[PDB]
Design a protein around this ligand. Structure first.
Ligand SMILES: NC(=O)C1=CN([C@@H]2O[C@H](COP(=O)(O)OP(=O)(O)OC[C@H]3O[C@@H](n4cnc5c(N)ncnc54)[C@H](OP(=O)(O)O)[C@@H]3O)[C@@H](O)[C@H]2O)C=CC1
Ligand SMILES: NC(=O)C1=CN([C@@H]2O[C@H](COP(=O)(O)OP(=O)(O)OC[C@H]3O[C@@H](n4cnc5c(N)ncnc54)[C@H](OP(=O)(O)O)[C@@H]3O)[C@@H](O)[C@H]2O)C=CC1
Lengths: 278, 280
């Protein structure tokens, strides 16, 4: 049987997106006859690419820049977390119908779940972009007690906190970011969701790191380098840390679970990313 | 370095038994080409969106098999000469958004033929009058064949192809009935089986007086599996130079990728891959 289960990605540009290599290393290890097709899709082409995937009987696809908001017009249904975030980067094709999911905060959550439960937790998020918004939503849905969004543009922080308060069980709070700030002593989870440190081992987010102890799980969305200055400082302060490489891998695992109903191995996929980055 | 592969593929239904993916990708891999061939099961309701899908996904080309060879024509911008005469397309190149229809069904044969002899100015007999016989007649005519005789059980099917060759090409076309055991007309340079006789059957043979062939008659067979049909085993036993349908399929895959990429894959790699698959 020469038919492979078909998955893929629509984005532009797509050449720097390593998802194909890690997902296919997952497929191979799991002995699944399935493929991940990395497509360069322009904004003008999205509608036809989506229809393509349905006609070619794909079971799902990812969507990256610039298609995350644009894709919503093509959906027949949408997951709660996806809808709250306002963006979709993982579409399932179920019985010819398109269902939108967001995994940008789900990757973080599964990494988080290896070390602690989000339920009842006090969370500080640095950043108020797409990633921060996604992480805040998934945290709140999973039972987090209190989420603080810290951002230079306070109005962006205000938007996320209001979302958290209005639409979830969690308490959301916005904080204007000006200089280093001290963490509340009761902070369980501190997440960098800014672009600080992206391809830059020396740049650290302005937070008072002495207000940070081993009682706080420190996380960073930066995929490469995975060992950011932020995580390296937190580690030396005794904190458990989680990195953006592990998070990115988990987006791939969650995606394939949504598409195929099968759980690929994160360890294998993380080593593929390690290979590519290294 | 990096993660955008060249995308090619196939639209057909059903697609599970089509080994083109494995053959072509063995060529891609061996050449060091970051190119992929995506075997898609595409229902007739999905053909239009699949074609526009390949364009939007920025594929460089795709094959079409049953049941899309004729239906695809309506979704094309331009067509190559043989595909125009055949009225069917199995190989589409996407060039800066432009869809160009080609037919390679008889071009695999022609490539295989050319390793042993020129088609030009030659007298040819084709057994059968289906899709394969029609494609092979057209390619032969366009590559300079003098005379093409189409032999079929249903003589009116043979007539259709003869008239296509006579009216729309520079070659002379003749139709003949298949009266029991066929005797090869004197002076025939090339004899081709284009019937389905011998498909997955190493024992069934076209009803032909094999004694009518000369040692110099080139004898060819479309059947990909088994490559050595009874027909070709018997012709070889007489001393005839023979050409098998497995080599023809390899050549179709080579030609198709030349259409798409301007690159020639290793025919030996591809042949071995097919031989490994069919030997099961
Ligand atoms: N590992 C994973 O699974 C994932 C990782 N990511 C990564 O997350 C990062 C953020 O993504 P995304 O939300 O799309 O980015 P956006 O451009 O949407 O937002 C970036 C955020 O970073 C803040 N920021 C940037 N520079 C500074 C600075 N010097 N000081 C304080 N704040 C700063 C911005 O603040 P302001 O609002 O004031 O401009 C903004 O809130 C990216 O690097 C991306 O690679 C994303 C998704 C998943
Ligand atoms: N190697 C390659 O590259 C290619 C190989 N092929 C192969 O060629 C073969 C034919 O394909 P296609 O033309 O599409 O098939 P069709 O069904 O279109 O045509 C079948 C032809 O075979 C004749 N035929 C079948 N059985 C007999 C018999 N017992 N006695 C006399 N004549 C017979 C039919 O005669 P009638 O008209 O009287 O029914 C008809 O002319 C297939 O097996 C296919 O796999 C095809 C394309 C390419």
């Amino acid at each position: 049987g020469f038919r492979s289960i078909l998955t893929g990605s629509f984005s532009t540009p797509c050449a720097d997106n390593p998802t194909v290599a890690m997902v296919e290393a997952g497929y191979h290890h799991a002995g699944l006859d399935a493929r991940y097709i990395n497509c360069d899709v322009k904004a003008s082409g999205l509608a036809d690419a989506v229809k393509g995937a349905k006609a070619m009987e794909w079971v799902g696809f990812n969507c990256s820049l610039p298609h995350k908001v644009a894709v919503l017009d093509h959906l027949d249904d949408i997951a709660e977390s996806a809808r709250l975030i306002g963006a979709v980067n993982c579409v399932a094709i179920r019985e010819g119908k398109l269902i939108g999911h967001n995994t940008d905060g789900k990757g973080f959550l599964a990494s988080l779940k290896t070390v602690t439960s989000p339920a009842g937790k006090r969370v500080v998020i640095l950043g108020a972009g797409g990633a921060a918004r996604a992480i805040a939503v998934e945290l709140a849905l999973a039972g987090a007690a209190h989420i603080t969004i810290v951002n230079r543009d306070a109005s962006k922080a205000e938007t996320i906190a209001a979302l958290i308060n209005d639409k979830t069980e969690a308490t959301g709070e916005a904080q204007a970011w000006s200089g280093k700030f001290s963490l509340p002593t009761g902070t369980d989870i501190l997440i960098n969701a800014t672009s600080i440190g992206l391809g830059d081992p020396n740049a650290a987010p302005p937070v008072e790191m002495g207000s940070l102890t081993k009682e706080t799980v420190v996380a960073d969305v930066i995929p490469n380098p995975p060992q950011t200055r932020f995580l390296k400082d937190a580690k030396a302060l005794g904190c458990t840390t989680l990195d953006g490489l592990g998070m990115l891998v988990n987006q791939g695992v969650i995606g394939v679970e949504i598409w195929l109903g099968r759980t690929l191995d994160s360890a294998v996929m993380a080593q593929t990313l390690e290979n590519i980055f290294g």
